[PDB]
Scaffold this active site. Structure first.
Site, PDB file in Angstrom:
ATOM      1  N   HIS A  46      -1.065   3.186  -4.542  1.00  0.00           N
ATOM      2  CA  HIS A  46      -0.194   2.203  -4.872  1.00  0.00           C
ATOM      3  C   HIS A  46      -0.522   0.639  -5.361  1.00  0.00           C
ATOM      4  O   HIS A  46      -1.582   0.234  -4.859  1.00  0.00           O
ATOM      5  CB  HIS A  46       0.733   2.007  -4.057  1.00  0.00           C
ATOM      6  N   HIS A  48       0.417  -2.881  -4.311  1.00  0.00           N
ATOM      7  CA  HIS A  48       1.329  -3.627  -3.752  1.00  0.00           C
ATOM      8  C   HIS A  48       1.386  -5.030  -4.303  1.00  0.00           C
ATOM      9  O   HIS A  48       0.453  -5.415  -4.756  1.00  0.00           O
ATOM     10  CB  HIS A  48       0.888  -3.546  -2.262  1.00  0.00           C
ATOM     11  N   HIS A  63       5.294  -2.392  -2.135  1.00  0.00           N
ATOM     12  CA  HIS A  63       5.187  -1.856  -3.471  1.00  0.00           C
ATOM     13  C   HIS A  63       5.433  -3.062  -4.548  1.00  0.00           C
ATOM     14  O   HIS A  63       6.323  -3.807  -4.405  1.00  0.00           O
ATOM     15  CB  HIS A  63       6.004  -0.752  -3.860  1.00  0.00           C
ATOM     16  N   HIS A  71      11.715   4.108  -6.202  1.00  0.00           N
ATOM     17  CA  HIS A  71      10.359   4.556  -6.291  1.00  0.00           C
ATOM     18  C   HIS A  71      10.350   6.063  -6.730  1.00  0.00           C
ATOM     19  O   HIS A  71      11.161   6.780  -6.225  1.00  0.00           O
ATOM     20  CB  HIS A  71       9.734   4.787  -4.962  1.00  0.00           C
ATOM     21  N   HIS A  80       8.444   2.275  -9.284  1.00  0.00           N
ATOM     22  CA  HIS A  80       8.098   0.754  -9.228  1.00  0.00           C
ATOM     23  C   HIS A  80       7.059   0.600 -10.215  1.00  0.00           C
ATOM     24  O   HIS A  80       6.299   1.544 -10.649  1.00  0.00           O
ATOM     25  CB  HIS A  80       7.400   0.711  -7.805  1.00  0.00           C
ATOM     26  N   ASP A  83       3.763   2.283  -8.652  1.00  0.00           N
ATOM     27  CA  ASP A  83       3.665   3.473  -8.430  1.00  0.00           C
ATOM     28  C   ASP A  83       2.891   4.434  -9.363  1.00  0.00           C
ATOM     29  O   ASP A  83       3.171   5.129 -10.374  1.00  0.00           O
ATOM     30  CB  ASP A  83       5.069   4.101  -8.632  1.00  0.00           C
ATOM     31  N   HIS A 120      -3.337   5.363   0.511  1.00  0.00           N
ATOM     32  CA  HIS A 120      -2.508   5.513   1.814  1.00  0.00           C
ATOM     33  C   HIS A 120      -3.115   6.863   2.551  1.00  0.00           C
ATOM     34  O   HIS A 120      -3.830   7.840   1.948  1.00  0.00           O
ATOM     35  CB  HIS A 120      -1.063   5.648   1.614  1.00  0.00           C
ATOM     36  N   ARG A 143      -1.922   2.482   5.660  1.00  0.00           N
ATOM     37  CA  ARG A 143      -2.584   2.087   4.397  1.00  0.00           C
ATOM     38  C   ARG A 143      -4.386   2.174   5.221  1.00  0.00           C
ATOM     39  O   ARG A 143      -4.760   1.448   6.174  1.00  0.00           O
ATOM     40  CB  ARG A 143      -2.468   0.482   4.329  1.00  0.00           C
TER      41      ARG A 143
END
Lengths: 153, 153
Positions: A46, A48, A63, A71, A80, A83, A120, A143
């Protein structure tokens, strides 16, 4: 403006280099590089919101979602901006990352330069995991490694 | 009132957090934070061109110098965009940092978001050191710590 790079680091063994490249200001960004130190299988990938690492990966915030949608996965209409789905680590794992994307951009409003790329703990479930946090984050876990996205030569 | 932030890290023990804020789109950038891990006295404090940390601080490349000027001090007309001067370590190795600057920007041609902030080994001599190098880099020596400048809450 046309090439970017992210160096991924965190508290454990997950590390890697991700390159972004946009041929044209309104075409797709190519995304490639690799990550090592991963448990075999799928890991959420992702962008962020914040290029902020003052307190580890957690300070990158949520995000990146400036259009404020729900999402989903990278090929969904509803997702997002950040994403980018999942990357797949092999058994030595090692994820070889090779992706093209038309929502993220290296210029303008959806611009990801100065934001944080994060890999992640587990698979992104892509909105289809059947609970509340699946529609907010896809339950990808914690994370493992992050890095601010910067201007590359 | 757009804000940015930088976390500095390197192979040695220097560390810190730097913030930038540019409350109105034309005018000055406030920059404050703290840095530890330093030797008493003065250290060169610069924006370099690439947000590229793939070989440590070396991959940030040269001073950010979009207008091809000669190296100088932040108060000079003749200065790199990236030339923020020197910060100052007390006897315990701590620099409190409260610059304000009107050449760097968080938007436009002089935008430093996604580039690299670096704190140096030696004093920057501000281009008044009387050799060829004073006028390219200020003789500030080694890159002790750097990080990519990112978008903040």
């Amino acid at each position: 403006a046309t090439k970017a790079v992210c160096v991924l680091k965190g508290d454990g063994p997950v590390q890697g280099i991700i390159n972004f490249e946009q041929k044209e200001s309104n075409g797709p960004v190519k995304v490639w590089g690799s990550i090592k130190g991963l448990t075999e299988g799928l890991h959420g990938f992702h962008v962020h919101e914040f290029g902020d690492n003052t307190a580890g990966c957690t300070s990158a915030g949520p995000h990146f979602n400036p259009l404020s949608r729900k999402h989903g996965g990278p090929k969904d209409e509803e997702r997002h901006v950040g994403d980018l789905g999942n990357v797949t680590a092999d058994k030595d794992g090692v994820a070889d990352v090779s992706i093209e994307d038309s929502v993220i951009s290296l210029s303008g409003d959806h611009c990801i330069i100065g934001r944080t790329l994060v890999v992640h703990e587990k698979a992104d479930d892509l909105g289809k995991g059947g609970n509340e946090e699946s529609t907010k984050t896809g339950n990808a876990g914690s994370r493992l490694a992050c890095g601010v996205i910067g201007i590359a030569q």
